[PDB]
Design a protein around this ligand. Structure first.
Ligand SMILES: [Cu+2]
Ligand SMILES: [Cu+2]
Length: 440
């Protein structure tokens, strides 16, 4: 009804249960004016959005119809690592049922994708990803209830011969970015707003591309980070979203008109190829070229809603009982990536911590590219980066580190079991930059 906007089909819980069979299968699709066979969940790119409420039961049966094994990571969900099992393999032709309960305090935007080590980057790049939304009682206050809500899945692509483009040697070093910069699987869609206040849930599901988001003539009001609400709205002129990160923003359209949502130039330290003999800046790739993500059309005579005065207070965290240091390094030409000097070994436990305690983690990027650090199972609070305070309080599960930056994270250890932490430039994860945490 009214103007259409491309957006994944939503599957909702009913009577406290979301039970769904989801097949991972090669799928011919229409895309950017052409036909391509992608790897998809549920026959769509992106996959379907699962929408639940706290205390719901999720029962998702993943049906592997791919030519290779796979698994699922429930990215950002603070559940058991015996469910969110990074070491599980589902062979081709087999199924596996993931069952869990949505925690009572959780809210925001999460996502699911493959996590079979060694094959994450080709599988995610081929199209295997979908969103998960946890509704909150806060969504009922008038300042959010009457906003026009949309999910925006930011994910680029490159095609060759009607299939996802193959990974090159440069791709394993830099991470793979595509030439088709898509929103919900569409090339530069147009959103004809019917309300003057929009609530946009944003997901960077790209392998490696960064999105320095800016809306023409408008600020963004950040109300949620990766894993939950902020304490109150935070006005920003632009918002950088690293791979794996999510955010929710309100947009207040004041004037009629058509406004571009753009991914402004950002230099994440990727490296170019060689030869040379010039006068200025080469060798690095330098900043991304600017991209138009979508066109936003404001409604007639727009009067936006007032902003909410407060959102969700952030929990007081106890004093930490241990401090950890995790140093990220790289060898670019070999395209190998390390944590404290070692590459991932699934038979090696790297950190041993205690359930029901809080730790400080100091994560130090001693490389030259941005690396976005992700910890499964245990959401954290970013204290500082580079010795300066983080700009808000909210649960995160991905923190971006530029060259030489050190992040101090407060990590409450929740569920027992064995889980992982890794760079979410998933090529780097495939090429070494992952370690194992065991909680007892
Ligand atoms: Cu992830
Ligand atoms: Cu990395």
């Amino acid at each position: 009804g009214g103007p259409s906007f491309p957006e994944p089909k939503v599957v909702r819980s009913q009577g406290g249960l979301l039970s769904l069979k989801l097949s991972a299968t090669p799928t011919p699709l229409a895309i950017a004016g052409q036909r391509a066979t992608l790897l998809t969940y549920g026959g769509s790119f992106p996959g379907p959005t699962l929408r639940v409420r706290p205390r719901d039961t999720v029962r998702l049966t993943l049906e592997n119809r791919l030519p290779e094994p796979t698994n699922l990571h429930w990215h950002g969900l603070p559940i058991s690592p015996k469910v969110d099992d990074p070491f599980l393999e589902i062979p081709p032709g087999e199924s596996w049922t993931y069952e869990f309960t949505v925690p009572k305090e959780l809210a925001g935007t999460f996502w699911y994708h493959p996590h079979l080590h060694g094959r994450v980057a080709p599988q995610l790049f081929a199209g295997l990803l979908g969103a998960l939304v946890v509704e909150s009682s806060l969504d009922a206050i008038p300042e959010l209830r009457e906003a026009e809500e949309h999910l925006l899945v930011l994910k680029d692509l490159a095609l060759q011969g009607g299939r996802p483009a193959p990974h090159t040697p440069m791709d394993w070093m830099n991470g793979k970015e595509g030439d088709l910069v898509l929103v919900n699987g569409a090339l530069r869609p147009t959103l004809v707003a019917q309300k003057a206040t929009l609530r946009l849930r944003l997901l960077n599901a790209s392998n490696a591309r960064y999105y320095r988001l800016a809306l023409q003539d408008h600020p963004l009001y950040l109300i949620a980070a990766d894993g939950g609400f902020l304490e109150e709205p935070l006005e920003v002129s632009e918002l950088l979203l690293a791979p794996g990160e999510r955010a929710e923003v309100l947009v207040r359209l004041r004037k009629e008109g058509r406004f571009l949502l753009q991914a402004l130039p950002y230099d994440r330290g990727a490296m170019g190829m060689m030869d040379m003999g010039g006068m200025a800046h080469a060798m690095p790739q330098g900043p991304s070229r600017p991209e138009t993500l979508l066109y936003l059309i404001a409604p007639k005579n727009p009067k936006p809603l007032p902003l909410p005065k407060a959102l969700s207070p952030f929990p007081t965290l106890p004093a930490p009982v241990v401090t950890r240091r995790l140093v990220l390094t790289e060898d670019m030409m070999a395209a190998r990536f390390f944590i404290n000097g070692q590459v991932f070994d699934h038979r090696r436990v790297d950190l041993k911590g205690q359930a029901q305690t809080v730790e400080v983690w100091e994560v130090e990027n001693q490389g030259d590219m941005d690396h976005p650090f992700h910890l499964h199972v245990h959401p954290f609070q970013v204290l500082s980066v580079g010795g300066r305070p983080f700009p808000y309080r909210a649960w995160k599960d991905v923190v971006n580190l530029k060259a030489g930056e050190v992040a101090r994270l407060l990590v409450p250890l929740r569920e027992k079991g064995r889980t992982v932490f890794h760079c979410h430039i998933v090529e780097h994860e495939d090429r070494g930059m992952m370690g194992v945490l065991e909680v007892g």
